[model samples]
Target: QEFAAVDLGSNSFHMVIARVVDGAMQIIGRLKQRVHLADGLGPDNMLSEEAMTRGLNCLSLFAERLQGFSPASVCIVGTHTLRQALNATDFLKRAEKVIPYPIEIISGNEEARLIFMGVEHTQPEKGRKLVIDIGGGSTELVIGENFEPILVESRRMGCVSFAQLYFPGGVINKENFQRARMAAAQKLETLTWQFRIQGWNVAMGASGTIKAAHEVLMEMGEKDGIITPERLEKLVKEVLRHRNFASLSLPGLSEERKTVFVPGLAILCGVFDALAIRELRLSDGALREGVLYEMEGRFRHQDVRSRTASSLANQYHIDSEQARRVLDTTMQMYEQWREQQPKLAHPQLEALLRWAAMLHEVGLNINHSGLHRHSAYILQNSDLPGFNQEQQLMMATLVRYHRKAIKLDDLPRFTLFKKKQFLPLIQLLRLGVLLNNQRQATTTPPTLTLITDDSHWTLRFPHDWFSQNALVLLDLEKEQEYWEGVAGWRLKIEEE
Candidate 1:
């Protein structure tokens, strides 16, 4: 299945649409806009009207391209500016109407995890390496081995925010350069001792600003794409030496990036100096790549999301027995549904159904009263390692409706599927979960005759069994209404 991811960074907004086939992810499309949204945050921690308009307008344009895209197939995330803006809520409320998907304002640490995940999955490294992504409002540093991130941290500084703070005007000067560098270094200080102490095998840089800056330095015959202290110093000095951004003609400096390139360069320089990084190898892939690769891994059976769920289970001490019961029965139901409804199926949907089945009971740790809501809240807020915002939403939606009635307002939050496709899929998930409500490991679902005509659906449960288990009758009755009442589809359950 093809999935899309949108990253709204402080300096830029990027979208990647891709699909995986034969063990490799193929990029279908890409779009980027240099919004520099971080530049628009006012002193009151609110996005200035100009900045909000810039970001929202860009997103509206993006939404047009994603018109019919299922929300499950698209993930949207906002980085530092969203993290720091208390006014983000006000902006997002308005943005939600224009966009096809909900936007998650990720935490700095969570951002670091996703950044490293993106970087690590982009390519394979021989050892635990340090990966860095310098964005407009923050920098993520991660040390990891294999696909798992071991040490992840996000510093308070980034290219866009730094540029606006240190060099408010386009005018360049040595003092402002030094101030920016020092500010970056100060944030790096928090991780300096930790990173230096642990030390990685290699240091890699990511994101547009760093990639563009490194390209320019190489074009100028500075370091040839490998960032060194000397290269850092040279780039910084050259940027400061220039009187105006207009006068700077570094080889790879696009007319568009000239204003922010210097500031991004300074951050890289500070990182190199503080971490004693000798060579900065550039990685074209970051968070987006990581997401694609992680999805690939899951399809191939090395599903990190399962591992993440288990880790969370242990951390929160969820009921393993109950979860297993739901999972076992859900899988049985999915296999039947897959075989029966192969025409309307895709790999990503099946995987999410399975994952949601396994994780439906995770909310019991919070409280029994409306545990579905708690589960939804946790899924909305938790640090699910391999899932982006969209994936999380679909999975959470399934779990939320696993027990309780689906809310009218909540139903529309999932913009991933088409109007025709969404309800059937959600109904399928709900039915699958409900039949397994007993959470019995031995409870195997009887083959139900499935048929659909227009919006009407019929699921015929085994005849004699219904008389034996009267408690499950209520769920079967409710299932009819959910499909008919809530979803506007006629549902009939036939008993033999």
Candidate 2:
């Protein structure tokens, strides 16, 4: 089977179509377009009209290449640029039409993790390793052994932002380079101590800036492609000898890279100095490759998200039996709802419900007071490895609205498309949680049937089920009141 991965990076847009052959990925197609989305972001964190147009045009080209591909085989992810854009939702509404797939904006730490995965799979070097990737709006530093990452961090410094800050009018000089390096040093200060203390047997660099720099070094007669401090200093001196980006005559430096080259170099230099690196190797594989591998794992039933969920459950000391009971009921209710409302049956939607069911009670470890709020906060803010920002927020919202007052004001103001779909999931979670309130009862759950007609839900139990479980019936009555009064939806419970 063929799989495609799209990296909507802040500096460049990249797409790779590949397929596994004899246990290795064989590249079938590749595309890279320099949209520089981060360069168009303003102080208000809104993307400019021109920037949006450029990004859409690039996506349109990618769309043509992806026409024959199935949605299951293609995965597209957005990075720091989309994360920073306040108007990203508006942009994505248009973007979804061009790409014909949902674009996921990943968290910074998740980005770091994916970068490490890419390096591990492609480079295949053993022992402890440090990997650095400098993008347009952020830099990731990761330390790992073999295929598993030990520490991952993303610093808020990148080529495009630094260029805008230190290279006004596209001027290039030693002073501004020093200024950029100083700023990078400040950003690196937060994580350098831990990385240095942990150390690494091998150091490697990845992505455009490193590859471009490596090529320049090779062209300048530096053998073996190893980047040393001496070679970097020489390259910087050559860059400073010129007056502007237009005048830089360095070998192997492309026209596309000239604008952001100085800033990228400064960041790399700062990293080398702070980490006390003498030489570094470069890797061609990066985020897009990592995305492809991650997508492939999902098809094989070895998804990292399953591990992440188990890890979260173990970390919070959740009661496995209760969680399983809630999950079983949640899925049962979800299936019934899907049969009644066919249009609401989405694979992603159902998967999210299952995850939220598994993790709903995690907040109980903190305290019982407003525990749902705590659960939401933890899910919403935690660096869930395989989940995107939207997915995390969705899970958090489900847990938040699972129980309690069902206040509209407490919920997130969802986008136009999600506003309708979120309500059913919320209702399902509430029902599941309420049914399992006593947690592991002696008797099996009653034969329950759910019927939905528009905004009203009718739940029917066996003839004498409610009679025996008086407390559950009372809780259901309170639930009906909350849904009716606060949510403007009706919940009716009946005995057969």
Candidates in order have lDDT scores of 0.75, 0.86
- Candidate 2 lDDT over 335-394, as tens digits, reads 888998888677776778899999998898888888888888888988788888887888
> What TM-score goes with each of the models?
0.69, 0.96
Give lDDT: candidate 1, residue 410: 57
Residue-level lDDT tens digits of model 1 in 1-496: 7888888877778999999778667988988998878888877888898999999999999999888888767778877898788787777888988895878665676677767777766666568889999887788898887766777888877777777788877668898788877778888787789888888888888887778867877887765678788777777777777876678777788887887787787788788778899887888788777655554565567866778777877876776776666666556555655565666667766777777766776777788898888877887678677665556777787777776556656563433444454445566667766776775533554656666664566766676777766767777887776655564667777775
State model 2's lDDT.
Answer: 0.86
| Candidate 1 stretches greater than 4 Å from native | 1-125, 136-138, 154-157, 182-197, 211-238, 249-256, 269-279, 283-321, 331-343, 440-459, 463-467, 474-494
- Give candidate 2 misplaced runs (Cα > 4 Å): 407-417, 440-444, 486-488
Model 2: lowest-lDDT 10 consecutive positions: 410-419
**Residue 54, candidate 1: C-alpha displacement in angstroms:** 11
